[PDB]
Design a protein around this ligand. Structure first.
Ligand SMILES: [Ca+2]
Length: 537
Protein backbone atom coordinates (compact mmCIF):
# COMPACT_ATOMS: atom_id res chain seq x y z
CA UNK A 1 0.00 0.00 0.00
CA UNK A 2 1.36 3.39 -1.02
CA UNK A 3 2.83 5.11 1.99
CA UNK A 4 0.54 8.19 1.93
CA UNK A 5 -2.63 6.11 2.41
CA UNK A 6 -1.45 5.50 5.96
CA UNK A 7 0.06 8.96 6.52
CA UNK A 8 -0.82 12.10 8.37
CA UNK A 9 0.41 15.32 6.76
CA UNK A 10 1.27 18.52 8.67
CA UNK A 11 1.28 21.89 6.89
CA UNK A 12 4.00 24.34 7.87
CA UNK A 13 3.53 27.96 6.81
CA UNK A 14 7.24 28.83 6.94
CA UNK A 15 7.12 32.62 7.52
CA UNK A 16 5.09 32.02 10.65
CA UNK A 17 6.44 28.76 12.10
CA UNK A 18 9.78 29.47 13.85
CA UNK A 19 12.27 32.37 13.52
CA UNK A 20 15.76 31.16 14.38
CA UNK A 21 17.89 34.18 13.49
CA UNK A 22 16.04 37.20 14.88
CA UNK A 23 14.48 38.91 11.89
CA UNK A 24 10.86 38.21 12.84
CA UNK A 25 10.37 35.85 9.90
CA UNK A 26 10.14 32.07 10.22
CA UNK A 27 12.93 30.18 8.45
CA UNK A 28 14.22 26.73 7.50
CA UNK A 29 16.57 26.30 10.45
CA UNK A 30 13.59 27.15 12.66
CA UNK A 31 11.61 24.28 11.13
CA UNK A 32 14.59 21.98 11.57
CA UNK A 33 14.74 22.93 15.27
CA UNK A 34 11.14 21.73 15.73
CA UNK A 35 11.41 18.30 14.04
CA UNK A 36 11.51 16.53 17.49
CA UNK A 37 8.15 18.09 18.28
CA UNK A 38 6.61 17.02 14.97
CA UNK A 39 7.91 13.47 15.46
CA UNK A 40 6.38 13.46 18.94
CA UNK A 41 3.06 14.43 17.40
CA UNK A 42 3.73 11.57 14.98
CA UNK A 43 3.20 13.14 11.56
CA UNK A 44 4.67 11.50 8.44
CA UNK A 45 5.15 14.41 6.09
CA UNK A 46 5.37 18.19 6.13
CA UNK A 47 3.61 20.13 3.39
CA UNK A 48 5.89 23.13 3.24
CA UNK A 49 4.27 26.30 1.85
CA UNK A 50 6.49 28.09 -0.68
CA UNK A 51 10.06 28.98 0.31
CA UNK A 52 11.26 29.89 -3.20
CA UNK A 53 12.64 33.28 -4.21
CA UNK A 54 9.64 35.62 -4.29
CA UNK A 55 8.88 39.37 -4.03
CA UNK A 56 6.14 38.39 -1.55
CA UNK A 57 3.15 40.15 -3.16
CA UNK A 58 1.16 36.99 -2.36
CA UNK A 59 3.48 35.86 0.45
CA UNK A 60 5.47 33.40 -1.61
CA UNK A 61 2.92 32.21 -4.18
CA UNK A 62 4.42 34.76 -6.62
CA UNK A 63 7.66 32.96 -7.47
CA UNK A 64 10.54 34.67 -9.29
CA UNK A 65 12.87 31.60 -9.30
CA UNK A 66 11.64 28.02 -8.91
CA UNK A 67 15.07 26.64 -8.13
CA UNK A 68 16.32 29.18 -5.60
CA UNK A 69 15.45 29.50 -1.90
CA UNK A 70 14.31 32.92 -0.84
CA UNK A 71 17.06 34.39 1.38
CA UNK A 72 14.56 35.21 4.11
CA UNK A 73 14.25 31.44 4.76
CA UNK A 74 17.96 30.57 4.44
CA UNK A 75 19.80 28.77 1.66
CA UNK A 76 19.59 25.64 -0.48
CA UNK A 77 21.99 24.06 1.99
CA UNK A 78 19.30 24.70 4.64
CA UNK A 79 16.63 23.14 2.40
CA UNK A 80 18.79 20.07 1.80
CA UNK A 81 19.44 19.76 5.57
CA UNK A 82 15.70 19.96 6.36
CA UNK A 83 14.99 17.15 3.88
CA UNK A 84 17.80 15.06 5.40
CA UNK A 85 17.03 15.80 9.06
CA UNK A 86 13.30 15.35 8.50
CA UNK A 87 14.00 11.93 6.97
CA UNK A 88 15.89 10.94 10.14
CA UNK A 89 12.66 11.72 12.02
CA UNK A 90 10.60 9.63 9.55
CA UNK A 91 9.11 12.78 7.98
CA UNK A 92 9.00 13.44 4.24
CA UNK A 93 8.96 16.96 2.76
CA UNK A 94 6.14 17.81 0.34
CA UNK A 95 6.91 20.98 -1.63
CA UNK A 96 4.34 23.47 -2.85
CA UNK A 97 4.31 23.42 -6.66
CA UNK A 98 3.06 26.72 -8.04
CA UNK A 99 3.01 26.40 -11.81
CA UNK A 100 -0.17 28.14 -12.95
CA UNK A 101 1.60 31.50 -12.82
CA UNK A 102 4.88 33.14 -11.89
CA UNK A 103 6.00 36.36 -10.33
CA UNK A 104 6.20 39.24 -12.79
CA UNK A 105 9.83 39.32 -11.63
CA UNK A 106 10.46 35.81 -12.94
CA UNK A 107 13.05 35.96 -15.73
CA UNK A 108 10.53 34.46 -18.21
CA UNK A 109 8.17 37.38 -17.66
CA UNK A 110 10.90 40.01 -17.52
CA UNK A 111 11.78 38.66 -20.95
CA UNK A 112 8.22 38.29 -22.27
CA UNK A 113 7.46 41.90 -21.26
CA UNK A 114 10.12 43.14 -23.64
CA UNK A 115 7.91 42.68 -26.70
CA UNK A 116 5.85 40.47 -28.97
CA UNK A 117 8.88 38.88 -30.63
CA UNK A 118 10.79 38.01 -27.45
CA UNK A 119 11.35 34.23 -27.28
CA UNK A 120 9.47 34.02 -23.95
CA UNK A 121 6.42 36.02 -25.09
CA UNK A 122 4.22 32.95 -25.54
CA UNK A 123 5.04 31.66 -22.01
CA UNK A 124 2.20 33.96 -20.90
CA UNK A 125 -1.20 34.85 -22.24
CA UNK A 126 -1.46 38.07 -24.25
CA UNK A 127 -4.59 39.49 -25.93
CA UNK A 128 -5.54 42.62 -27.84
CA UNK A 129 -8.12 44.96 -26.36
CA UNK A 130 -11.69 44.40 -27.49
CA UNK A 131 -13.76 47.56 -28.09
CA UNK A 132 -11.20 49.64 -26.21
CA UNK A 133 -11.58 47.50 -23.07
CA UNK A 134 -10.45 44.18 -21.59
CA UNK A 135 -10.69 41.07 -23.79
CA UNK A 136 -13.52 39.71 -21.65
CA UNK A 137 -15.04 39.89 -18.17
CA UNK A 138 -12.85 37.32 -16.35
CA UNK A 139 -12.09 38.44 -12.77
CA UNK A 140 -9.04 38.20 -10.52
CA UNK A 141 -9.39 36.46 -7.19
CA UNK A 142 -7.79 39.53 -5.62
CA UNK A 143 -10.49 41.94 -6.96
CA UNK A 144 -10.72 43.56 -10.35
CA UNK A 145 -10.16 42.25 -13.84
CA UNK A 146 -8.07 39.18 -14.65
CA UNK A 147 -6.54 41.26 -17.49
CA UNK A 148 -3.70 43.72 -16.90
CA UNK A 149 -2.86 46.26 -19.63
CA UNK A 150 0.72 46.45 -20.87
CA UNK A 151 1.44 49.93 -22.25
CA UNK A 152 4.40 49.13 -24.47
CA UNK A 153 2.81 46.30 -26.44
CA UNK A 154 -0.77 47.56 -26.20
CA UNK A 155 -1.97 44.12 -25.13
CA UNK A 156 -3.38 42.74 -21.88
CA UNK A 157 -1.89 39.79 -20.04
CA UNK A 158 -3.91 37.28 -18.01
CA UNK A 159 -3.61 36.95 -14.24
CA UNK A 160 -6.25 35.03 -12.25
CA UNK A 161 -4.42 36.24 -9.12
CA UNK A 162 -2.35 39.41 -8.53
CA UNK A 163 -1.15 41.71 -11.30
CA UNK A 164 2.25 40.44 -10.21
CA UNK A 165 1.25 36.81 -10.83
CA UNK A 166 1.09 36.61 -14.64
CA UNK A 167 -0.52 33.33 -15.75
CA UNK A 168 1.57 30.79 -17.62
CA UNK A 169 0.43 29.59 -21.05
CA UNK A 170 0.02 25.79 -20.71
CA UNK A 171 -0.55 25.39 -24.46
CA UNK A 172 3.15 26.17 -24.88
CA UNK A 173 4.95 22.83 -25.14
CA UNK A 174 8.41 24.24 -24.46
CA UNK A 175 7.17 25.75 -21.23
CA UNK A 176 5.50 22.51 -20.09
CA UNK A 177 8.79 20.66 -20.54
CA UNK A 178 10.75 23.31 -18.62
CA UNK A 179 8.22 22.97 -15.80
CA UNK A 180 8.64 19.16 -15.88
CA UNK A 181 12.43 19.47 -15.83
CA UNK A 182 12.22 21.84 -12.85
CA UNK A 183 9.91 19.38 -11.07
CA UNK A 184 12.50 16.66 -11.65
CA UNK A 185 15.21 18.81 -10.07
CA UNK A 186 13.12 18.86 -6.87
CA UNK A 187 12.08 15.20 -7.11
CA UNK A 188 15.77 14.23 -7.45
CA UNK A 189 16.41 15.85 -4.08
CA UNK A 190 14.41 13.13 -2.28
CA UNK A 191 11.23 15.10 -1.51
CA UNK A 192 8.07 13.18 -0.65
CA UNK A 193 5.92 14.86 -3.28
CA UNK A 194 4.07 18.04 -4.29
CA UNK A 195 1.04 20.01 -3.17
CA UNK A 196 -0.14 21.56 -6.43
CA UNK A 197 -1.36 25.11 -6.19
CA UNK A 198 -4.60 25.83 -8.04
CA UNK A 199 -3.72 22.97 -10.37
CA UNK A 200 -7.34 22.87 -11.68
CA UNK A 201 -6.55 26.05 -13.64
CA UNK A 202 -3.99 24.60 -16.03
CA UNK A 203 -6.70 23.63 -18.57
CA UNK A 204 -7.80 27.29 -18.68
CA UNK A 205 -8.94 28.63 -22.06
CA UNK A 206 -9.72 32.30 -21.48
CA UNK A 207 -10.88 32.94 -25.06
CA UNK A 208 -13.79 30.65 -24.20
CA UNK A 209 -14.10 32.05 -20.68
CA UNK A 210 -12.82 28.72 -19.34
CA UNK A 211 -10.96 28.93 -16.02
CA UNK A 212 -11.12 25.82 -13.79
CA UNK A 213 -11.80 22.32 -15.13
CA UNK A 214 -10.84 23.06 -18.73
CA UNK A 215 -10.62 20.36 -21.46
CA UNK A 216 -6.83 19.96 -21.44
CA UNK A 217 -6.58 19.74 -17.60
CA UNK A 218 -6.48 15.96 -17.28
CA UNK A 219 -4.46 15.39 -20.47
CA UNK A 220 -1.80 17.81 -19.11
CA UNK A 221 -1.72 16.08 -15.72
CA UNK A 222 -1.32 12.66 -17.37
CA UNK A 223 1.52 14.07 -19.47
CA UNK A 224 3.01 15.64 -16.34
CA UNK A 225 2.76 12.40 -14.36
CA UNK A 226 4.63 10.43 -17.07
CA UNK A 227 7.33 13.10 -17.44
CA UNK A 228 7.94 13.61 -13.74
CA UNK A 229 6.60 11.70 -10.70
CA UNK A 230 4.75 8.80 -12.27
CA UNK A 231 7.25 6.16 -11.13
CA UNK A 232 8.54 7.98 -8.07
CA UNK A 233 6.41 6.80 -5.11
CA UNK A 234 5.66 10.30 -3.96
CA UNK A 235 2.40 11.86 -2.83
CA UNK A 236 0.80 14.45 -5.07
CA UNK A 237 -2.17 16.43 -3.80
CA UNK A 238 -3.88 18.96 -6.07
CA UNK A 239 -5.58 22.07 -4.69
CA UNK A 240 -8.94 21.91 -6.44
CA UNK A 241 -11.50 24.44 -5.15
CA UNK A 242 -13.97 23.40 -7.83
CA UNK A 243 -13.67 19.63 -7.57
CA UNK A 244 -16.78 17.47 -7.23
CA UNK A 245 -16.48 13.87 -6.01
CA UNK A 246 -16.48 12.70 -9.65
CA UNK A 247 -13.75 15.12 -10.66
CA UNK A 248 -11.74 14.07 -7.60
CA UNK A 249 -11.83 10.49 -8.93
CA UNK A 250 -10.59 11.64 -12.32
CA UNK A 251 -7.61 13.25 -10.56
CA UNK A 252 -6.94 10.39 -8.12
CA UNK A 253 -7.85 7.11 -9.83
CA UNK A 254 -4.52 5.24 -9.86
CA UNK A 255 -5.41 3.79 -13.28
CA UNK A 256 -5.60 7.35 -14.70
CA UNK A 257 -1.98 8.09 -13.73
CA UNK A 258 -2.58 11.61 -12.52
CA UNK A 259 -2.40 12.58 -8.82
CA UNK A 260 -2.64 10.79 -5.46
CA UNK A 261 -5.54 12.92 -4.22
CA UNK A 262 -7.00 16.44 -4.20
CA UNK A 263 -8.09 19.06 -1.68
CA UNK A 264 -11.79 19.80 -2.24
CA UNK A 265 -13.45 22.90 -0.82
CA UNK A 266 -17.18 22.22 -1.13
CA UNK A 267 -17.90 23.11 2.50
CA UNK A 268 -16.31 26.59 2.17
CA UNK A 269 -19.34 28.23 0.59
CA UNK A 270 -21.75 26.97 3.29
CA UNK A 271 -21.37 30.21 5.21
CA UNK A 272 -21.70 32.72 2.37
CA UNK A 273 -24.76 34.08 0.60
CA UNK A 274 -25.66 32.17 -2.59
CA UNK A 275 -24.32 33.73 -5.79
CA UNK A 276 -22.08 36.17 -3.92
CA UNK A 277 -18.57 36.25 -2.43
CA UNK A 278 -17.13 34.66 0.72
CA UNK A 279 -17.28 38.15 2.26
CA UNK A 280 -21.09 38.13 2.11
CA UNK A 281 -21.75 36.23 5.29
CA UNK A 282 -24.45 33.83 6.36
CA UNK A 283 -24.61 31.46 9.32
CA UNK A 284 -23.54 27.89 8.77
CA UNK A 285 -26.33 25.32 8.76
CA UNK A 286 -24.82 22.30 10.56
CA UNK A 287 -27.05 19.94 8.63
CA UNK A 288 -25.55 21.19 5.39
CA UNK A 289 -22.06 20.72 6.82
CA UNK A 290 -23.02 17.16 7.78
CA UNK A 291 -24.34 16.44 4.27
CA UNK A 292 -21.13 17.64 2.63
CA UNK A 293 -18.97 15.64 5.01
CA UNK A 294 -21.04 12.53 4.37
CA UNK A 295 -21.16 13.05 0.57
CA UNK A 296 -17.38 12.98 0.26
CA UNK A 297 -17.17 9.82 2.38
CA UNK A 298 -19.83 7.82 0.55
CA UNK A 299 -19.85 9.04 -3.05
CA UNK A 300 -16.11 8.63 -3.66
CA UNK A 301 -15.26 5.15 -4.95
CA UNK A 302 -12.19 4.29 -2.88
CA UNK A 303 -11.50 1.25 -5.09
CA UNK A 304 -10.67 3.75 -7.82
CA UNK A 305 -9.74 7.01 -6.09
CA UNK A 306 -8.46 8.52 -2.87
CA UNK A 307 -9.55 11.42 -0.66
CA UNK A 308 -7.86 14.09 1.43
CA UNK A 309 -9.28 15.36 4.75
CA UNK A 310 -8.64 18.82 6.22
CA UNK A 311 -10.21 21.65 8.17
CA UNK A 312 -7.47 24.26 7.98
CA UNK A 313 -4.80 25.74 5.80
CA UNK A 314 -3.07 29.07 5.13
CA UNK A 315 -6.02 30.41 3.14
CA UNK A 316 -8.89 29.78 5.51
CA UNK A 317 -9.76 30.72 9.05
CA UNK A 318 -9.43 28.49 12.12
CA UNK A 319 -12.25 25.97 12.10
CA UNK A 320 -13.16 26.20 15.80
CA UNK A 321 -13.60 30.00 15.47
CA UNK A 322 -15.49 29.80 12.18
CA UNK A 323 -17.87 26.92 12.74
CA UNK A 324 -17.53 26.04 16.40
CA UNK A 325 -16.80 27.71 19.71
CA UNK A 326 -13.38 29.05 20.60
CA UNK A 327 -14.23 30.30 24.07
CA UNK A 328 -15.26 28.11 27.01
CA UNK A 329 -15.93 25.07 24.79
CA UNK A 330 -12.67 25.59 22.86
CA UNK A 331 -11.02 22.36 24.00
CA UNK A 332 -14.02 20.17 23.48
CA UNK A 333 -14.88 21.78 20.15
CA UNK A 334 -11.33 21.39 18.76
CA UNK A 335 -11.29 17.74 19.83
CA UNK A 336 -14.67 17.15 18.20
CA UNK A 337 -13.48 18.45 14.82
CA UNK A 338 -10.25 16.39 15.09
CA UNK A 339 -12.10 13.18 16.01
CA UNK A 340 -14.76 13.28 13.31
CA UNK A 341 -12.20 14.02 10.57
CA UNK A 342 -9.37 11.68 11.56
CA UNK A 343 -11.67 8.67 11.74
CA UNK A 344 -12.80 9.34 8.17
CA UNK A 345 -11.63 7.56 5.01
CA UNK A 346 -8.72 9.45 3.36
CA UNK A 347 -5.40 11.08 4.26
CA UNK A 348 -5.69 13.72 7.04
CA UNK A 349 -3.86 17.02 7.01
CA UNK A 350 -3.17 19.05 10.15
CA UNK A 351 -2.46 22.74 9.72
CA UNK A 352 0.25 24.13 12.00
CA UNK A 353 -1.29 25.17 15.34
CA UNK A 354 -4.52 23.22 14.77
CA UNK A 355 -3.17 20.57 17.14
CA UNK A 356 -3.29 23.11 20.05
CA UNK A 357 -6.54 24.83 19.07
CA UNK A 358 -5.18 28.12 17.76
CA UNK A 359 -8.02 30.53 17.05
CA UNK A 360 -8.83 33.42 14.74
CA UNK A 361 -7.21 36.77 15.46
CA UNK A 362 -9.68 39.64 15.07
CA UNK A 363 -8.53 43.07 13.95
CA UNK A 364 -10.07 46.50 14.59
CA UNK A 365 -8.85 48.17 11.46
CA UNK A 366 -7.37 47.66 8.01
CA UNK A 367 -3.87 48.77 9.02
CA UNK A 368 -3.65 45.53 11.05
CA UNK A 369 -4.15 43.44 7.89
CA UNK A 370 -1.37 42.45 5.46
CA UNK A 371 -2.99 40.06 2.96
CA UNK A 372 -3.57 41.46 -0.54
CA UNK A 373 -6.87 39.59 -0.77
CA UNK A 374 -8.34 41.30 2.31
CA UNK A 375 -6.90 44.73 1.54
CA UNK A 376 -8.12 44.74 -2.03
CA UNK A 377 -11.60 43.64 -0.99
CA UNK A 378 -11.66 46.35 1.70
CA UNK A 379 -10.63 49.15 -0.65
CA UNK A 380 -13.03 48.17 -3.43
CA UNK A 381 -16.03 47.67 -1.13
CA UNK A 382 -15.23 50.88 0.80
CA UNK A 383 -15.21 52.76 -2.53
CA UNK A 384 -18.49 51.06 -3.47
CA UNK A 385 -20.08 52.36 -0.23
CA UNK A 386 -20.22 49.23 1.91
CA UNK A 387 -20.32 49.58 5.68
CA UNK A 388 -16.72 49.73 6.92
CA UNK A 389 -17.53 47.95 10.20
CA UNK A 390 -18.99 45.03 8.27
CA UNK A 391 -15.84 44.95 6.09
CA UNK A 392 -13.68 44.54 9.15
CA UNK A 393 -16.11 41.94 10.43
CA UNK A 394 -15.91 40.09 7.07
CA UNK A 395 -12.12 40.04 7.34
CA UNK A 396 -12.42 38.77 10.93
CA UNK A 397 -14.60 35.89 9.74
CA UNK A 398 -13.03 35.04 6.33
CA UNK A 399 -9.66 36.79 6.20
CA UNK A 400 -6.58 34.64 5.43
CA UNK A 401 -4.39 36.46 7.97
CA UNK A 402 -6.28 34.57 10.67
CA UNK A 403 -4.44 31.46 9.44
CA UNK A 404 -1.08 33.16 9.25
CA UNK A 405 -0.45 34.32 12.79
CA UNK A 406 2.79 33.16 14.36
CA UNK A 407 2.86 29.64 15.73
CA UNK A 408 2.40 29.73 19.52
CA UNK A 409 5.17 27.73 21.16
CA UNK A 410 5.10 29.02 24.75
CA UNK A 411 4.19 31.97 26.92
CA UNK A 412 7.42 33.92 26.31
CA UNK A 413 7.70 37.07 24.26
CA UNK A 414 5.91 36.63 20.94
CA UNK A 415 4.90 33.14 22.05
CA UNK A 416 8.48 31.98 21.49
CA UNK A 417 8.17 32.48 17.74
CA UNK A 418 10.75 35.27 17.69
CA UNK A 419 12.79 37.58 19.91
CA UNK A 420 12.00 40.58 17.71
CA UNK A 421 8.70 41.97 16.35
CA UNK A 422 7.20 39.24 14.13
CA UNK A 423 6.39 40.01 10.50
CA UNK A 424 2.76 39.65 11.54
CA UNK A 425 1.84 40.18 15.18
CA UNK A 426 1.12 37.28 17.50
CA UNK A 427 -2.43 36.54 18.61
CA UNK A 428 -2.81 37.99 22.12
CA UNK A 429 -4.34 34.72 23.35
CA UNK A 430 -0.99 32.91 23.14
CA UNK A 431 -0.65 33.12 26.95
CA UNK A 432 -3.18 30.31 27.39
CA UNK A 433 -2.91 28.70 23.93
CA UNK A 434 0.59 27.43 23.28
CA UNK A 435 2.52 24.25 22.70
CA UNK A 436 4.31 24.21 26.06
CA UNK A 437 1.04 24.47 27.96
CA UNK A 438 -0.62 21.83 25.76
CA UNK A 439 2.23 19.35 26.30
CA UNK A 440 2.02 19.86 30.06
CA UNK A 441 -1.68 19.01 30.13
CA UNK A 442 -2.58 15.40 29.35
CA UNK A 443 -6.18 16.45 28.59
CA UNK A 444 -5.00 18.93 25.95
CA UNK A 445 -6.00 19.07 22.29
CA UNK A 446 -2.50 18.00 21.33
CA UNK A 447 -2.80 14.53 22.91
CA UNK A 448 -6.13 14.02 21.17
CA UNK A 449 -4.41 14.63 17.83
CA UNK A 450 -1.42 12.46 18.81
CA UNK A 451 -3.78 9.67 19.81
CA UNK A 452 -5.82 9.89 16.58
CA UNK A 453 -2.64 9.71 14.54
CA UNK A 454 -1.45 6.64 16.47
CA UNK A 455 -4.83 4.95 16.00
CA UNK A 456 -4.61 5.51 12.26
CA UNK A 457 -1.00 4.20 12.07
CA UNK A 458 -1.88 1.05 14.02
CA UNK A 459 -5.38 0.07 12.89
CA UNK A 460 -6.15 -0.85 9.26
CA UNK A 461 -9.85 -0.18 9.82
CA UNK A 462 -9.09 3.58 10.09
CA UNK A 463 -7.14 3.43 6.79
CA UNK A 464 -9.17 1.03 4.65
CA UNK A 465 -12.48 0.60 6.46
CA UNK A 466 -15.68 1.46 4.68
CA UNK A 467 -17.68 4.46 5.87
CA UNK A 468 -21.33 3.87 6.75
CA UNK A 469 -23.64 6.59 7.98
CA UNK A 470 -25.76 6.00 11.06
CA UNK A 471 -29.26 6.73 9.71
CA UNK A 472 -31.81 9.17 11.07
CA UNK A 473 -29.85 11.21 13.58
CA UNK A 474 -30.44 14.91 14.27
CA UNK A 475 -28.96 17.37 11.77
CA UNK A 476 -26.54 18.47 14.46
CA UNK A 477 -25.32 14.92 15.17
CA UNK A 478 -22.87 13.13 12.90
CA UNK A 479 -22.45 9.45 13.65
CA UNK A 480 -20.94 6.79 11.42
CA UNK A 481 -19.22 3.43 11.28
CA UNK A 482 -15.90 2.40 9.84
CA UNK A 483 -16.18 -1.25 8.81
CA UNK A 484 -13.34 -3.62 7.86
CA UNK A 485 -14.27 -7.28 7.40
CA UNK A 486 -15.83 -8.34 10.69
CA UNK A 487 -14.60 -5.31 12.71
CA UNK A 488 -16.68 -2.19 13.19
CA UNK A 489 -15.95 1.13 14.95
CA UNK A 490 -18.61 3.74 15.73
CA UNK A 491 -17.93 7.47 15.81
CA UNK A 492 -20.51 9.74 17.44
CA UNK A 493 -20.22 13.53 17.30
CA UNK A 494 -22.23 16.56 18.37
CA UNK A 495 -21.43 19.25 15.78
CA UNK A 496 -23.26 21.86 17.87
CA UNK A 497 -22.77 23.84 21.05
CA UNK A 498 -25.99 22.50 22.58
CA UNK A 499 -27.27 19.18 23.89
CA UNK A 500 -28.42 16.59 21.39
CA UNK A 501 -30.20 13.25 21.77
CA UNK A 502 -28.66 10.09 20.33
CA UNK A 503 -30.10 6.60 20.18
CA UNK A 504 -28.35 3.31 19.31
CA UNK A 505 -28.69 -0.45 19.98
CA UNK A 506 -24.98 -0.99 19.49
CA UNK A 507 -23.03 -2.32 22.42
CA UNK A 508 -19.78 -0.44 22.61
CA UNK A 509 -16.39 -0.18 24.18
CA UNK A 510 -15.14 3.40 24.09
CA UNK A 511 -11.62 4.09 22.75
CA UNK A 512 -11.43 7.86 22.92
CA UNK A 513 -13.64 10.76 23.95
CA UNK A 514 -13.50 14.47 24.69
CA UNK A 515 -15.78 13.89 27.68
CA UNK A 516 -15.87 11.13 30.30
CA UNK A 517 -16.18 7.77 28.54
CA UNK A 518 -19.54 6.08 28.07
CA UNK A 519 -20.30 2.36 28.17
CA UNK A 520 -23.55 2.56 26.26
CA UNK A 521 -25.41 4.75 23.80
CA UNK A 522 -28.93 3.35 24.10
CA UNK A 523 -30.50 6.72 24.84
CA UNK A 524 -28.13 9.53 25.69
CA UNK A 525 -27.84 13.27 25.73
CA UNK A 526 -24.66 14.45 24.06
CA UNK A 527 -22.99 17.36 25.80
CA UNK A 528 -21.87 20.34 23.66
CA UNK A 529 -19.35 19.18 21.03
CA UNK A 530 -19.25 15.77 22.67
CA UNK A 531 -17.51 13.28 20.39
CA UNK A 532 -16.13 9.79 20.82
CA UNK A 533 -14.86 6.67 19.12
CA UNK A 534 -16.05 3.19 20.17
CA UNK A 535 -15.47 -0.43 19.13
CA UNK A 536 -18.82 -2.02 18.30
CA UNK A 537 -19.29 -5.37 20.05
CA1 LIG B 1 14.25 34.31 10.51
Amino acid sequence: ASWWKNAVVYQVYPKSFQDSNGDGIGDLQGIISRLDYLEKLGIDAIWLSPVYQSPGVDNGYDISDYEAIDPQYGTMADMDELISKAKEHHIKIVMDLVVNHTSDQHKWFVEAKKGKDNQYRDYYIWRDPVDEHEPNDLKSAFSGSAWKYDERSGQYYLHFFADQQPDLNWQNTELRQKIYNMMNFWLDKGIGGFRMDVIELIGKDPDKNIRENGPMLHPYLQEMNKATFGKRDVMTVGETWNATPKIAEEYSDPDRHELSMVFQFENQSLDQQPGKEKWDLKPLDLGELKKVLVKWQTKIDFDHAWNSLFWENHDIPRVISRWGNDQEYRVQCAKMFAIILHMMHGTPYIFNGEEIGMTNCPVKNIDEVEDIESINMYNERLAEGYDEEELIHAINVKGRDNARRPMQWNDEKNAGFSEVDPWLSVNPNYKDINVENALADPNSIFYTYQKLIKLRHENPIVVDGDFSLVSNTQDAVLAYYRILNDKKWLVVANLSNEEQNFVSNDQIETILSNYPERNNVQNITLKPYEAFISKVI
